[PDB]
Protein: Lysozyme C
Organism: Gallus gallus
Amino acid sequence: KVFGRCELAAAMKRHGLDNYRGYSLGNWVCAAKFESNFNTQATNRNTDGSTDYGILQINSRWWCNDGRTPGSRNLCNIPCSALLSSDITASVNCAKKIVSDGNGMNAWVAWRNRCKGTDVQAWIRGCRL
């Protein structure tokens, strides 16, 4: 499933991401846009054997377990397959653990490169929230 911008904003708000650890809703929508283009089924293989999963491209070396990644830590204690659901609950719950890790949203490369410092509020304008 590919979420629409405003549809995703509403879902992320429902799951309590607005201002979570100091990051406004627009930051999360912006991250999803550049990480997966709002695609819940996106996957990306990396040179280290790990794979990034889902709408927020969560990595299998540190956060979820896919059983084929060396040095896996599974800090979110969840199978990576659960992050490929049309329901974003699992991804949001893990993302909350990632952002509380110590480096904020810098954990998402796409966010630091394309969202940080910009008018992220633009991502929620025009939406009924």
Remarks:
- The longest strand covers residues 43-45.
